[PDB]
Design a protein around this motif. Structure first.
Motif, PDB file in Angstrom:
ATOM      1  N   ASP A   1       0.799  -1.225   0.000  1.00  0.00           N
ATOM      2  CA  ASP A   1       0.000   0.000   0.000  1.00  0.00           C
ATOM      3  C   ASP A   1       0.834   1.280   0.000  1.00  0.00           C
ATOM      4  O   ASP A   1       0.567   2.210   0.762  1.00  0.00           O
ATOM      5  CB  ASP A   1      -0.999  -0.009   1.154  1.00  0.00           C
TER       6      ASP A   1
ATOM      7  N   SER B   1      -7.438  -0.519  -5.269  1.00  0.00           N
ATOM      8  CA  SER B   1      -7.329   0.664  -4.444  1.00  0.00           C
ATOM      9  C   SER B   1      -6.436   1.752  -5.073  1.00  0.00           C
ATOM     10  O   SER B   1      -6.663   2.935  -4.833  1.00  0.00           O
ATOM     11  CB  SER B   1      -6.814   0.293  -3.046  1.00  0.00           C
TER      12      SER B   1
ATOM     13  N   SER C   1       2.040  -2.539  -4.351  1.00  0.00           N
ATOM     14  CA  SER C   1       2.199  -3.771  -3.565  1.00  0.00           C
ATOM     15  C   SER C   1       3.197  -4.772  -4.185  1.00  0.00           C
ATOM     16  O   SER C   1       2.855  -5.453  -5.147  1.00  0.00           O
ATOM     17  CB  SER C   1       0.832  -4.459  -3.383  1.00  0.00           C
TER      18      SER C   1
END
Lengths: 215, 211, 215, 211
Positions: C145, C174, C178
């Motif tokens: 993230d 999102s 990652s």
């Protein structure tokens, strides 16, 4: 050395539009026919479009003919494209031709997540269960993380409209929507009115009733 | 107008002489161009008009053919050259590409060493659980990863990531991330990860009983 | 009746670019000077730009002069704008003039969330507790993230390079990144040595070391 | 060139005659235009060149002035008219607006009836907790909401939502949403919501001991 560069890419949802632009360096696109190309996850390349000198022409590929649109700026030297899960690609602005009559940009990432619609979650903003006296209480139905607008909120299905305030939806830094729907009724009718919020979400065909009640 | 390249994956070593065939569905004269692409870079134009070399590109490359049959030729492969090669029919106003030809460093059929990790609890604590699945040092590149939570076949909640040929063993390594909330994760006991590959004579599974 | 319409709006991050386009109905922009305008959260309105007939001119407001760019298409009739926390607004494409020599679009929402950068979270993918025999084990550092790329992952700070495979970053639905960073070492050196993953995130100036030891 | 409108919030009733002043920082002749906007709609052009009425707009409106002083006049307010009004200096190639004038239905200083809801456990179950704060039926519109979890002052993890003048009491209602994970919520005991407003002689607080 000859350069092009792409800007305007990111996360699109299904059916979506997003617009891409092409800036160049050290050259004049005016006498060129420019072409956008995308690379698919298959690794394979895909001419999306081409716009001619003077914009005499705009030729599209078939899987994109009608959702897409290319345009050229022969003065400040910019090309553009208007806009499916399958549209997910890295998009390359390109210039056809030769050193006599060939030049590409680094590309920008374009992805389209599969869901056009997402139903909303209905949770009860409880008054209280200790309740009694003879005062005002307020309850409700918090309608969270839907898209797209709209979300019509009802209470008991058409009969308690008084004191009702369906708050405007807010766009979370997530991009999903969120509206509070409240109603002032007696602190004394918390136990017998039962309070039923009918959140009808027309885009995702979702209807979730939710009982509002004291925990 | 349909272009189709052969083969899809061409394997060879350092110093090799290799070749790719591109074929048009109709007569395209000598209007065909070749392109080197390295992953994430801009592709790079090498050859145009079936056999005219773009200035700036070394002698060891050469193209040919006409009509519906064409052929590119790298003569003496270098490490600088391990990449993917695109054929293009560029017209007046439209164009069409082949499905491309990836050129790798050939080595022996080595299967994926399959490991499985669970989600820690400094992250099982915050509201998510990330269930990982690693395919260590395999070749060739084609490999299939299919998640199995309490033995249901998952679909679309797993994301992958394939390394390039490790600088040493010419093998690939793959990484397949299964994202779930901390609330659809603590619903099911077993977490099965099932790998199919050319060096396994059968699909290799690696799981964990939650907790 | 005269119409204009905006497309290309959504969630942008700080410093960001996103492109807006203007389609019209029933009229010809060619002889117009068109203007984009935004409404700020203050309710107050804001001319952002204007492009003249024949594109003889492009005038920008001061708080946007240089990050922004308008362009016009006099043929298919489209206008465009290229692209801060304060840029957050509803953007309206507009046509100046008169019935003799006035016409507006519904606007599209443009928001810019404040963070240009977000450091990454470092969690230990612990070796497999079935281990034994004098066999292979595999461990790692799951770097989750962040944005933007890049994330360099180096092990024990420069000394364990063998058998290391730093996997390609993946863009979550999102929009945050990652990457998995793994290393094969003996199932027999899991106890004495210790494994330290130095995830250095140059954009957000974030450095988080993270110890990889067992469960 | 700077345009500035006065007042910022003009209150009046149905049938009233009201007026807004716009002032240029320099002489702008008669190059000035007026705009009605209703929330979320396109704004709408009423008046141009200081006093020439746009066809399609009813007689009960009129503009005036020249130089650096101007004035718009709605004559006989209707419900169709409660909205916001923009002044524009439109040049050859550039322009500049004032900060606008919002026209509401005037009523008495009524403070916000302040309630607070906690997050339920069909949602405290999934990995989030949404802590709500409602300001029921207040006027005027200016109201300040400042979260306080175990008494620290929050900043930027709260989102608001203001209704329009309820069709009955001309009051406003506000909704201020505090989003936290199910892991930064169960860290702190008290959840304080503190409202400042013209009808309260002091800031009204409403909280809950978690559980």
């Amino acid at each position: 050395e000859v350069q092009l560069v792409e800007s305007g890419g990111g996360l699109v949802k299904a059916g979506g539009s997003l617009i891409l632009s092409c800036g160049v360096s050290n050259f004049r696109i005016s006498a060129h026919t420019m072409n956008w190309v995308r690379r698919v996850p298959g690794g394979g390349l895909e001419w999306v479009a081409s716009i001619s000198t003077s914009s005499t022409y705009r030729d599209y590929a078939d899987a994109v003919k009608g959702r897409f649109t290319v345009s050229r700026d022969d003065l400040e030297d910019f090309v553009y494209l208007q806009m499916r899960v399958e549209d997910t690609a890295i998009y390359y602005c390109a210039r056809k031709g030769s050193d006599r009559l060939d030049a590409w940009g680094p590309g920008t990432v374009v992805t389209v997540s599969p869901a056009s619609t997402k139903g909303p979650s209905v949770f009860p903003l409880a008054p209280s269960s200790k309740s009694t006296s003879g005062g005002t209480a307020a309850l409700g139905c918090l309608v969270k993380d839907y898209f797209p607008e709209p979300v019509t909120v009802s209470w008991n299905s058409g009969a308690l409209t008084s004191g009702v305030h369906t708050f405007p939806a807010v766009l979370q830094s997530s991009g999903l929507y969120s509206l509070s729907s409240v109603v002032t009724v007696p602190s004394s009718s918390l136990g017998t009115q039962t309070y039923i919020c009918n959140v009808n979400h027309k885009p995702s065909n979702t209807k979730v009733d939710k009982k509002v009640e004291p925990k | 107008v349909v272009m189709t390249q052969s083969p899809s994956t061409l394997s060879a070593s350092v110093g090799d002489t290799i070749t790719i065939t591109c074929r048009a569905s109709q007569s395209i004269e000598t209007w065909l161009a070749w392109y080197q692409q390295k992953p994430g870079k801009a592709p790079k134009l090498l050859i145009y008009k079936a056999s005219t070399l773009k200035t700036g590109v070394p002698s060891r490359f050469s193209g040919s053919g006409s009509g519906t049959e064409f052929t590119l030729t790298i003569s003496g492969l270098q490490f600088d050259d391990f990449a993917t090669y695109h054929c293009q029919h560029y017209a007046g106003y439209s164009a069409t590409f082949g499905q491309g030809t990836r050129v790798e460093i050939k080595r022996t059929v080595a299967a994926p060493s399959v490991f499985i990790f669970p989600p820690s609890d400094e992250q099982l604590k915050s509201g998510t659980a990330s269930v990982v699945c690693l395919l260590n040092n395999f070749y060739p590149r084609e490999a299939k990863v299919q998640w199995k939570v309490d033995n249901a076949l998952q679909s679309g909640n797993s994301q992958e990531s394939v390394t390039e040929q490790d600088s040493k063993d010419s093998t690939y390594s793959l990484s397949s991330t299964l994202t779930l909330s901390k609330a659809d994760y603590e619903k099911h006991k077993v977490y099965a990860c099932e790998v199919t590959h050319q060096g396994l004579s059968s699909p290799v599974t690696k799981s964990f009983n939650r907790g």
